């Protein structure tokens, strides 16, 4: 993968008359937590939908893990874990069943980490998924993504709805994931977890890159 998990050059996409992206650039470099900052309407989620192959790009080059995101979106997706901006679960499945189900279509779950993640996020894994408050509904995705085989994490506002302590447990989990050579791309609006976790911030404004570099 040329030791560069992500490499975007001149990305472009229009949604009709709306120019969502107009020349975005990125480069994540095998081992670092990368901050993906920008205003509302910048094009942060859309980029995360282009790396996953859900959406096709009108121009430029994208090289995810050394391959094409659009045509190779099955063998590259078993090295990747994804946390969406809007977390939606199946209302009939249990909380502990969704973790196992989601982690099984990726590279696979790790039962040593799963138990200690459920232990310290304080989740109740025997409870239907339509009774989770906005905060135990995010712990399901966080535990499912942080206990899996993944050499790249694409987190999209992963601490939305977490009280000051469950979002300090998450920082420790990310810090100890970075120790074993895991690459993280972190999109967020809280510039208090970005300072503590991330170096190499990257700020985009209207689909274009306006700032980049180490903190």
């Amino acid at each position: 993968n040329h030791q560069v998990p992500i490499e975007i050059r001149g990305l472009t996409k229009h949604f009709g008359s709306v120019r969502a992206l107009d020349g975005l650039d990125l480069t994540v470099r095998e081992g670092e937590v990368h901050g993906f900052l920008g205003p509302n309407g910048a094009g942060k989620s859309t980029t995360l939908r282009i790396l996953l192959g859900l959406v096709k790009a009108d121009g430029g080059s994208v090289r995810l893990l050394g391959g094409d995101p659009w045509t190779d979106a099955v063998d590259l997706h078993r090295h990747i874990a994804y946390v969406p901006g809007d977390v939606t679960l199946w209302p009939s499945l249990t909380g502990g069943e969704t973790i196992d189900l989601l982690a099984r279509m990726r590279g696979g779950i790790d039962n040593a980490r799963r138990a200690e993640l459920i232990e310290r996020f304080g989740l109740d894994p025997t409870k239907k998924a339509r009774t989770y408050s906005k905060g135990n509904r995010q712990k399901v995705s966080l535990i499912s993504a942080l206990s899996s085989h993944a050499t790249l994490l694409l987190l999209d506002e992963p601490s939305s709805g977490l009280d000051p302590l469950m979002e300090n447990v998450f920082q420790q989990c990310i810090g100890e994931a970075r120790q074993r050579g895991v690459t993280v791309l972190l999109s967020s609006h809280i510039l208090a977890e970005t300072e503590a976790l991330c170096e190499k911030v990257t700020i985009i404004r209207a689909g274009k890159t306006v700032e980049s570099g180490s903190l």
Partner: protein, 510 residues
Amino acid sequence: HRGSGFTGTLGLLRLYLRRDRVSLPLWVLLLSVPLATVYIASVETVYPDRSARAAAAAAIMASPAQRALYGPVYNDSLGAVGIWKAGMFHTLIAVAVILTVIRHTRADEESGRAELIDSTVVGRYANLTGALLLSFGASIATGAIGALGLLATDVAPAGSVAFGVALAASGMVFTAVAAVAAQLSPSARFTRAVAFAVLGTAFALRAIGDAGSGTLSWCSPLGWSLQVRPYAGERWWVLLLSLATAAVLTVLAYRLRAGRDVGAGLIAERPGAGTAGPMLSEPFGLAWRLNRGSLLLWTVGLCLYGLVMGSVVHGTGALEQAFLALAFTMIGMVAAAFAVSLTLRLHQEETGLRAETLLAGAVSRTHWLASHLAMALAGSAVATLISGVAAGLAYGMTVGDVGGKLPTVVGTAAVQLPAVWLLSAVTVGLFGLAPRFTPVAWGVLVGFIALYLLGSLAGFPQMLLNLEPFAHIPRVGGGDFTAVPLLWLLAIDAALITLGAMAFRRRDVR
């Protein structure tokens, strides 16, 4: 000051009214206009001399099979014989009102609109009252239009009003049922299944009563409408029954509402399992887990319907053939609706933001699609074949042998599959080219059903009735079997499916 529980009813009613403004007029006209322009209009051509009409009546009262589907004929007047065939319109209006009430009450309330609406100055009962007013208005308008159309013909004018009022009452009785069912569970599909189980039971009781003495047809809201007896001596007081059952139930639908909380039902929830089993590790396992109850309920219902229809076939093999081939077409339509819903599971999955969660993994777009497609193609086939087997066993026992009457009834059920799968193919083709317009497969199916019912009866040319699959199905038994149309109905299906698949891999999941 000056506030009650019914505040906001008119505003909610009008924003329900404008939501379905291309659907409500269409079916309101479809269930009322073809009563004087088709059914009564095409009785002076088929049955001209009155001496002939009487003969037709003597051919209905001497066959329980024909009067199980439609009901008895009590005299040889032009109106009674002409409108005998239109006794099926008392079930379609019930289906329509049930769907409308559930759609506007519980389907929205499951999508979080209840919080947004009720956080305003909108009363507690406004949401219920708006849907009830809409359904009552629709069911009264269809009856009024039908009566006005029938009053312009040369039939007796009292029976026309009686039929219109009976048609209105048949749809008013099954609106309270839909409301009471909607007050029950937090899931909309469970409420729809509960509402339709009552209608199925009512139809089965009505059929068993009609095909026999007639005592058992007094225990069902359907069959309270045929005993009004338009054109054959009107029993007006029977409508009072349909006015009490609607009033008693609709009060309960309010008492069940003044004690639930927005979002819940009547029974609290129970804990599940904290670990997934060895079956829920795949899109195939996930799709199976979501459809177990629907598959079981549809299978049981179709098996019971086949068991009921097979007993009345023999209370001369040139009439049991014609009745079995006519009774299994209805089963084909019901299984087609089953397939359409099991495939719309896919549009409901994508529009709920849960498709991008699955597709952001080592799942392909064709392996995900062919996990709901494989359930729609298999559940309908299993249900239809089980219904055919049950009908064959019931028919064989009442005749004397089973091994000579089972294979033919199984073949009759199995030759309906190419027409059933065509609607799954249509839904898959729509989901992949125009995903937003996926739910018009319902309109396509209703158009096919309407064409089949009102086709060779209003004089359409035999090149306009060829645009539907239910007319091309062969006839198993004796000759007349070709097996060519099936080969033309399977191929089409494959093509459509392929098209949809090829149009999904090159698209945006946005």
